Design a protein around this ligand. Sequence first.
Ligand SMILES: CC(C)(C#Cc1ccc(-c2ccc(Cl)c3c(NS(C)(=O)=O)nn(CC(F)(F)F)c23)c([C@H](Cc2cc(F)cc(F)c2)NC(=O)Cn2nc(C(F)(F)F)c3c2C(F)(F)[C@@H]2C[C@H]32)n1)S(C)(=O)=O
Ligand SMILES: CC(C)(C#Cc1ccc(-c2ccc(Cl)c3c(NS(C)(=O)=O)nn(CC(F)(F)F)c23)c([C@H](Cc2cc(F)cc(F)c2)NC(=O)Cn2nc(C(F)(F)F)c3c2C(F)(F)[C@@H]2C[C@H]32)n1)S(C)(=O)=O
Ligand SMILES: CC(C)(C#Cc1ccc(-c2ccc(Cl)c3c(NS(C)(=O)=O)nn(CC(F)(F)F)c23)c([C@H](Cc2cc(F)cc(F)c2)NC(=O)Cn2nc(C(F)(F)F)c3c2C(F)(F)[C@@H]2C[C@H]32)n1)S(C)(=O)=O
Ligand SMILES: CC(C)(C#Cc1ccc(-c2ccc(Cl)c3c(NS(C)(=O)=O)nn(CC(F)(F)F)c23)c([C@H](Cc2cc(F)cc(F)c2)NC(=O)Cn2nc(C(F)(F)F)c3c2C(F)(F)[C@@H]2C[C@H]32)n1)S(C)(=O)=O
Ligand SMILES: CC(C)(C#Cc1ccc(-c2ccc(Cl)c3c(NS(C)(=O)=O)nn(CC(F)(F)F)c23)c([C@H](Cc2cc(F)cc(F)c2)NC(=O)Cn2nc(C(F)(F)F)c3c2C(F)(F)[C@@H]2C[C@H]32)n1)S(C)(=O)=O
Ligand SMILES: C=C(C)[C@@H]1CC[C@]2(C(=O)O)CC[C@]3(C)[C@H](CC[C@@H]4[C@@]5(C)CC[C@H](OC(=O)CC(C)(C)C(=O)O)C(C)(C)[C@@H]5CC[C@]43C)[C@@H]12
Ligand SMILES: O=P(O)(O)O[C@H]1[C@H](OP(=O)(O)O)[C@H](OP(=O)(O)O)[C@H](OP(=O)(O)O)[C@@H](OP(=O)(O)O)[C@H]1OP(=O)(O)O
Lengths: 232, 232, 232, 232, 232
Amino acid sequence: QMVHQAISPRTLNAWVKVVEEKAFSPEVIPMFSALSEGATPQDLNTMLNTVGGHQAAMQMLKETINEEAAEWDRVHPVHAGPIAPGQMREPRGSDIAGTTSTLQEQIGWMTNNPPIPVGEIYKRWIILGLNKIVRMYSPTSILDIRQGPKEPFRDYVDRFYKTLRAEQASQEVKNWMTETLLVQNANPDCKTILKALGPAATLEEMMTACQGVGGPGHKARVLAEAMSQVIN
Amino acid sequence: QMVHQAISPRTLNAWVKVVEEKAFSPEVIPMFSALSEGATPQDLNTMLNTVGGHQAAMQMLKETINEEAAEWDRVHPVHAGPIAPGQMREPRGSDIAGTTSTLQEQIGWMTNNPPIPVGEIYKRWIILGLNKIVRMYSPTSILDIRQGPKEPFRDYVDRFYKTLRAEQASQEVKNWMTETLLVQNANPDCKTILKALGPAATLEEMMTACQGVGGPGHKARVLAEAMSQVIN
Amino acid sequence: QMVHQAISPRTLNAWVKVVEEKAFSPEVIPMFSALSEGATPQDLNTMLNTVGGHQAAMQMLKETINEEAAEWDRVHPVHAGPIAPGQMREPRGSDIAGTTSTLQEQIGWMTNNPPIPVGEIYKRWIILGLNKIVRMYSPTSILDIRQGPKEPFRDYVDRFYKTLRAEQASQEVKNWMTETLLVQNANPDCKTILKALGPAATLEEMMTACQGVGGPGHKARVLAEAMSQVIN
Amino acid sequence: QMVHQAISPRTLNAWVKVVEEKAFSPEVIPMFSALSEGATPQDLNTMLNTVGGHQAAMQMLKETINEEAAEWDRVHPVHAGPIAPGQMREPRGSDIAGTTSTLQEQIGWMTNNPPIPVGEIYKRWIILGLNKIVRMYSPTSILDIRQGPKEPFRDYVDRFYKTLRAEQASQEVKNWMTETLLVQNANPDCKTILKALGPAATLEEMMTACQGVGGPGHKARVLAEAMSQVIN
Amino acid sequence: QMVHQAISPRTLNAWVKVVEEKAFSPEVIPMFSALSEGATPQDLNTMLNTVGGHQAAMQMLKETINEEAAEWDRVHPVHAGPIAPGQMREPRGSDIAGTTSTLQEQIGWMTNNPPIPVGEIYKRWIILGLNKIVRMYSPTSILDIRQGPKEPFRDYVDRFYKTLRAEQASQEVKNWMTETLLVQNANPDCKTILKALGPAATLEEMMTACQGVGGPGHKARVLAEAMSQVIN
Ligand SMILES: CC(C)(C#Cc1ccc(-c2ccc(Cl)c3c(NS(C)(=O)=O)nn(CC(F)(F)F)c23)c([C@H](Cc2cc(F)cc(F)c2)NC(=O)Cn2nc(C(F)(F)F)c3c2C(F)(F)[C@@H]2C[C@H]32)n1)S(C)(=O)=O
Ligand SMILES: CC(C)(C#Cc1ccc(-c2ccc(Cl)c3c(NS(C)(=O)=O)nn(CC(F)(F)F)c23)c([C@H](Cc2cc(F)cc(F)c2)NC(=O)Cn2nc(C(F)(F)F)c3c2C(F)(F)[C@@H]2C[C@H]32)n1)S(C)(=O)=O
Ligand SMILES: CC(C)(C#Cc1ccc(-c2ccc(Cl)c3c(NS(C)(=O)=O)nn(CC(F)(F)F)c23)c([C@H](Cc2cc(F)cc(F)c2)NC(=O)Cn2nc(C(F)(F)F)c3c2C(F)(F)[C@@H]2C[C@H]32)n1)S(C)(=O)=O
Ligand SMILES: CC(C)(C#Cc1ccc(-c2ccc(Cl)c3c(NS(C)(=O)=O)nn(CC(F)(F)F)c23)c([C@H](Cc2cc(F)cc(F)c2)NC(=O)Cn2nc(C(F)(F)F)c3c2C(F)(F)[C@@H]2C[C@H]32)n1)S(C)(=O)=O
Ligand SMILES: CC(C)(C#Cc1ccc(-c2ccc(Cl)c3c(NS(C)(=O)=O)nn(CC(F)(F)F)c23)c([C@H](Cc2cc(F)cc(F)c2)NC(=O)Cn2nc(C(F)(F)F)c3c2C(F)(F)[C@@H]2C[C@H]32)n1)S(C)(=O)=O
Ligand SMILES: C=C(C)[C@@H]1CC[C@]2(C(=O)O)CC[C@]3(C)[C@H](CC[C@@H]4[C@@]5(C)CC[C@H](OC(=O)CC(C)(C)C(=O)O)C(C)(C)[C@@H]5CC[C@]43C)[C@@H]12
Ligand SMILES: O=P(O)(O)O[C@H]1[C@H](OP(=O)(O)O)[C@H](OP(=O)(O)O)[C@H](OP(=O)(O)O)[C@@H](OP(=O)(O)O)[C@H]1OP(=O)(O)O
């Protein structure tokens, strides 16, 4: 037969925009519940594959799906023997998840009498994964990258640029983030030097200027400055 | 047959109260999805017709529904004509939306074997529309009606009263809104005159007092006052 | 037959965690609808019985379910006559709610041809109840217990400890709550006395110290001190 | 038959990441050319539908595809006469674009003898559209929203918030953008007032303070201050 | 047959409330012993699945159950051959715990002649696990999160918020904990700066103010302050 509730172009685009705009806020759960309703496991897998970024969250979701597939296998014993020509093989957990089943097999299960709603079972597994992601997963934010009090400036710059590469933004916005946040979120010892450097300093000049922060000479110099302030 | 999941009086009232209390915040999407499950397209249309105000949002929803009906028609080719006497005509997008189908026809599709869940397909279309509304539609608010720096006071009053007529509130709250926000949200040039006029001033008196703001006489008078302050 | 959408261990645990973490915030409505889909009324009742605390909310939910069951009974007239041996009895509202139906009967209704999705009907009833709870139910909070201006300190302490017993917290957190909030949220008249007592004062000492607040002696003493300030 | 070059989950995810990371820089053209080679028009349409945002760009692509389909229809004259039972209908432009053709028909055209590579023809059409997008389409940027010299502060705030809603960023990043760019990109006349307000000022306070900029009172006041400097 | 001592709704709710109120104080052991008496392994598994939080404790309980099942398998040799039609398979350790057995099999074992009380055997295994939890498991407490003498403020804040997410409390109580405990439980070096910041400081301002504690400039400054106190 055919699946009447196969996802339309606008449904898939709406799911993509939901993920892009809300990330994994709780609102993702009702949206996925409504957009994916009635769809085959193949359509749900398409929706899950359209998620860009958030690799850790998607790995969490995959682990949850595997656990639910194992639970399905535990609750459904394997039947050994020759299947009737009219009948078809009973779904397994991987068949529900669509890893070992074709679209035709999923449609056959969904439209059989009695029907096995493999799409809705898979949808509940995905919802469990999404709930786990919403509770536990925190996406990396370029706004959260601050230099540690004893962290070398080079290591902080490496962390900043790694997070910026992972950041969801336009390239112009990422350039503006580099121009604003990097010096702003440095630790005070490095920030003093960076401000003394001036606004026109390049990244290499900034990195050379802070290369000694925490070394013997810089420590002695700041200690001597503080002691001179005290004596005066 | 009969639809076991037809909307109850409490279900319809809950949907009405959801729309009235939350407008089109994201919470409207789960509630609708929960409140309309297993209902016919007729019940869904009844739920949609109970939305008071937000006419622009309802128009956006209608456009989304029409687009989804067109997609359904594209995916489902029409038949040649030999309809089986026992069988019924296959639904079109308009039939899914309930514009060209009766309640009996929708029930027949829903309870047929194999079943066509016309209600659930229509629900998915309505959810797509509601998502578009939540993302893109902003209801007019009496709170953000402010007089422009060069806007005539009469035009501002007309805008304020149009928004107030569109506002969801009781008549007493609307009167209090008129007494409070109209003078508060005027521009400084008109606001000074209104303050000098006194609380007892009526709408006609305020409008007459502010009729000359921005004209040559008022501009000359304010410029002369500023010049006199400068000279002194 | 067999129900393929029976709640798994992780589904039940997710529902328990949702109720514990979110109480009855609106997020409870989508989560329930997602976790409970396809389940029998028995699984729905299991989830409902897993709710610890919020007894008034659960009474509201029960009242809503009874009203929906009455609506179902009104809509479905009871038919007199012996049921066919192949057929089963038509469900009543109590049967959908699972009070008067066994799991076997629920599964038979859900997997019959034509099917009666008693699980989905009951789910919508529970959603109506949950929506009513979210709208109208506010859980008691230990943070909200504050001594009235003329309330005896003993009555305030009784209310505080009752609310603390109802509070969802660990014993250590409850002890810290007692150490912090009880004196903090006392009225000024008792609060000056409690501060004068000192940090080491026990509950009995605090209750004895404030036992006279509002009595003729305390009123006369505070009036005398105020008059001393005035005539100073 | 079957299509061996159907897009894999990783191929689709790579396309999604390309669009999210590069927007429509020229690099999109090689990536799309390489990721979509040998795919059916259905897979191509899926990839096109996973593009979030850039609605004007997608409309441009749709117009280019429609014009290429019209060119195909011009070049290939529709032949009148029943098709051979072994043969299949020749594809039209809409068939290559996938609007009026099913996946089975596309596979039949691609795997026929002689083959009609509808996937590759559609790929070239999409590449033409993408080239037009890369040359002529500029995405909106929140960094580009600056208040005009005579623009009311209300209108500038409206434009800023519309562009921010359209911006591809996390909610925290959008909040930081509101905190940073709105006052920064205001015109000098509003900017001096906003600075005088202080950092703690809310949006409504900022919007009330600038409500009179450009009005007769503000014009007179600034002219008076300038004349005070001159005649000093 | 049927299990006469299947857990009632009130039994399950009482178990949930026991775990919520008491966590894993020794009182859990008698309560579980009394609530679960006579129940099938399926019912006990339900009770264990209703435990929210304490995931480490539940993992310990699962390990104890697995060890007891292994001991059962060691003591009960596997019998190979054709089971009598009137007889059922002898239970294994996994069958006692209900992982590889169905409710029907458990009821058959429990009601057979001679009976195998699989529920009570499983109950003793669970009691052993609960005893191990009571002796060894210590739940995380937000009250126990204190900043180390050399710990960066950002790391301490991250630990605090992780523990707060795991804490059993209402959201309002968690907000109160954030407003009270975080500054209170910081180390003295950070607490001095935080107190100098003021009561209205946000989390970002607090993190910025302590970003340099332990860095060279801060160390020099505090050493200079101490030396100045000594010289004076
Ligand atoms: C052809 C088509 C119709 C199809 C299909 C199709 C078929 C099956 C599956 C699949 C489903 C369930 C499981 Cl449980 C496993 C599995 N279990 S396993 C042995 O442990 O790995 N493997 N698969 C791969 C399988 F089946 F091919 F083997 C799956 C997918 C998933 C959908 C999915 C994506 C996701 F993110 C998280 C999920 F839980 C499920 N997509 C992938 O898995 C590829 N992926 N994975 C991960 C990650 F690791 F981060 F989670 C990532 C991707 C990514 F999308 F690139 C993206 C960056 C993230 N799609 S179409 C048009 O969509 O292309
Ligand atoms: C008999 C009965 C059970 C029925 C039915 C019934 C049947 C069909 C439809 C309908 C459904 C879908 C489409 Cl797609 C079209 C269509 N497509 S079209 C060619 O472009 O216009 N037309 N219809 C009219 C049709 F079918 F009659 F032709 C429809 C409605 C809609 C329900 C609906 C309301 C809505 F807000 C938005 C929707 F998307 C759908 N209600 C209307 O449409 C009337 N409406 N419209 C608009 C607006 F334009 F602002 F959105 C407004 C109304 C309003 F309610 F007054 C309210 C102020 C807003 N109800 S009942 C309840 O009466 O007793
Ligand atoms: C055996 C099993 C499979 C089962 C079942 C099972 C079967 C039926 C029902 C039931 C369902 C619907 C109605 Cl409408 C009535 C009814 N209508 S009536 C004549 O007016 O009272 N009675 N019942 C009892 C019936 F059926 F026995 F008669 C019900 C329950 C409910 C589920 C439920 C819980 C709830 F909170 C609110 C609900 F709306 C429904 N649970 C109870 O009712 C016991 N309960 N009640 C209340 C309260 F009063 F606060 F709401 C409280 C409990 C509590 F859980 F302790 C908790 C503190 C709160 N469970 S299992 C594994 O789960 O144990
Ligand atoms: C079921 C499935 C296999 C399929 C399919 C499927 C089938 C066909 C088409 C399609 C292809 C070519 C043309 Cl030439 C037209 C057409 N020509 S016409 C009469 O002038 O409009 N109509 N269609 C709709 C048709 F065919 F239904 F009629 C098409 C699509 C396009 C793919 C596409 C996307 C795109 F962005 C630009 C394109 F050029 C083509 N997707 C849509 O069209 C929906 N869309 N449109 C636009 C816009 F208008 F902005 F461009 C937008 C969308 C959006 F994705 F939401 C996104 C925000 C942007 N997908 S699956 C798993 O992928 O869902
Ligand atoms: C359908 C139904 C009747 C049933 C059943 C049902 C059937 C079996 C089991 C089970 C029992 C014994 C073992 Cl010895 C194993 C096993 N041994 S193994 C190969 O090493 O992992 N696996 N199982 C899963 C099995 F059998 F399905 F494979 C089990 C469970 C357990 C009950 C249980 C919970 C628990 F906390 C600790 C236990 F010791 C036992 N529930 C789970 O296990 C799922 N779980 N696990 C863990 C953790 F890992 F943290 F401990 C957590 C959960 C959680 F509940 F989510 C919660 C957060 C914590 N329930 S119902 C109405 O209740 O849903
Ligand atoms: C004779 C006098 C009493 C005094 C004594 C000497 C004097 C002085 O020192 O005070 C020299 C300066 C002047 C001439 C004043 C008179 C007033 C004028 C005036 C206020 C006149 C109104 C004019 O305004 C416009 O044209 C309106 C405007 C918005 C610019 C438009 O139309 O585009 C401007 C240009 C703003 C001038 C500035 C110069 C001065 C101060 C004189
Ligand atoms: O629009 P504004 O900037 O607020 O000022 C305008 C405008 O001056 P601008 O050139 O700065 O825009 C007019 O144009 P100019 O003559 O100065 O070039 C001017 O005179 P005209 O209208 O005769 O051209 C006069 O306009 P008005 O006659 O209405 O006073 C004036 O004041 P307004 O703001 O009130 O328009």
